[PDB]
Amino acid sequence: LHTQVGRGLLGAVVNPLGEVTDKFAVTDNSEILYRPVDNAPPLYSERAAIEKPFLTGIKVIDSLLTCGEGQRMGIFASAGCGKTFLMNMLIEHSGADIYVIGLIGEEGREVTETVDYLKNSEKKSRCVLVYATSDYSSVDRCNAAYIATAIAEFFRTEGHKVALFIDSLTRYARALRDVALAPVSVFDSLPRLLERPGKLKAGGSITAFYTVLLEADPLAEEVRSILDGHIYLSRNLAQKGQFPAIDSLKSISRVFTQVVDEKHRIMAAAFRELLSEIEELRTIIDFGEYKPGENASQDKIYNKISVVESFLKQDYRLGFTYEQTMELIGETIR
């Protein structure tokens, strides 16, 4: 009900009891304070309107699904669509002040995969990991989300630009449903948990990414109406070699037009229509109706398939600045 916070947790691996059990980085600071894991969300008068972009360094996101500082973004995918690998990119290529990762419960060794990555990450001294594994009880798996959120909330109060990762909301809901078997329902602690991120007028911001495991869950329909948008990673795009396997046409950022300017909006609108006509031509090709020289309009969209796919794909080890992204999407568009 109370947990450790502070800069002394940077580089530490904390378990569902709030105790540091491992370290992926050692830092000068030893600041350790104590705050409750349950605290009230900011009143509407304390939240600032989302108006500044949270750049991720990922071309498809920053151009067509631009995030904002304080936004809550869902990541919907069926295992395995590289949802952990996209989060690694989001940590590695963004420019947040502090990253807080909460792994809700797994078998066990996947947690070590993340601590092994963090041990070799360039963001090691700006990261805190909270975990809960399948051995831990359903109450402990729930507390992992609140500890990760409370740790992120302290850094926001200090004025930091914080990025929070909860993986996953799916398995949090599993444990949360298990707790319900044991005015207030257990079930409705889910929306209160996701209401805490945001940019505060008197402090920093918490940009939160929640993962949802798919195989069209009822929970997916519940959470997608709560968040400020969602990123959909298509099974099919993954098997055809497109990484990140993000389907831009079924993903949205509801703060998109508040966080990008007008020439960006125009280029994104022109690119979305190009993508839609590309997908519409694919089905014509599979139907065996496409013949070169038949339709000059179809021929032009066909000759842009390669330039569009090259813009969409991205090496997981490479990040792009916003200027580079808008420069590349313009060459794809004209």
UniProtKB/Swiss-Prot annotation:
Oligomerization increases ATPase activity. Monomeric forms exhibit low-level ATPase activity by forming short-lived oligomers with active site contributions from at least two protomers. In contrast, oligomers exhibit enhanced ATP hydrolysis rates that likely result from multiple preformed active sites within the oligomeric complex. Oligomerization is important for both enzyme activation and T3SS function. It is an enzyme of class 7 (translocase). Transmembrane segments: none annotated. Changing residue 213 to D/A/I: Lacks ATPase activity. It catalyses: ATP + H2O + cellular proteinSide 1 = ADP + phosphate + cellular proteinSide 2. Changing residue 167 to E: Lack of ATPase activity. It comes from the Bacteria. Changing residue 83 to A: Lack of ATPase activity. Mutant is unable to form external MxiH/SctF needles and to restore the invasion phenotype in a knockout strain. Changing residue 195 to R: Reduces oligomerization. Lack of ATPase activity. Abolishes invasion and hemolysis phenotype. Low levels of secreted IpaC. ATP binds at residues 80-85. Changing residue 215 to A: Slight decrease in ATPase activity. Changing residue 106 to A: Lack of ATPase activity. Mutant is unable to form external MxiH/SctF needles and to restore the invasion phenotype in a knockout strain. Belongs to the ATPase alpha/beta chains family. T3SS ATPase subfamily. ATPase component of the type III secretion system (T3SS), also called injectisome, which is used to inject bacterial effector proteins into eukaryotic host cells. Acts as a molecular motor to provide the energy that is required for the export of proteins. Required for type III secretion apparatus (T3SA) formation, proper protein secretion, host cell invasion and virulence. May play a critical role in T3SS substrate recognition, disassembly of the effector/chaperone complex and unfolding of the effector in an ATP-dependent manner prior to secretion. This is Type 3 secretion system ATPase. The gene is sctN. The chain holds residues 83 to 430 of 430 of the full protein.
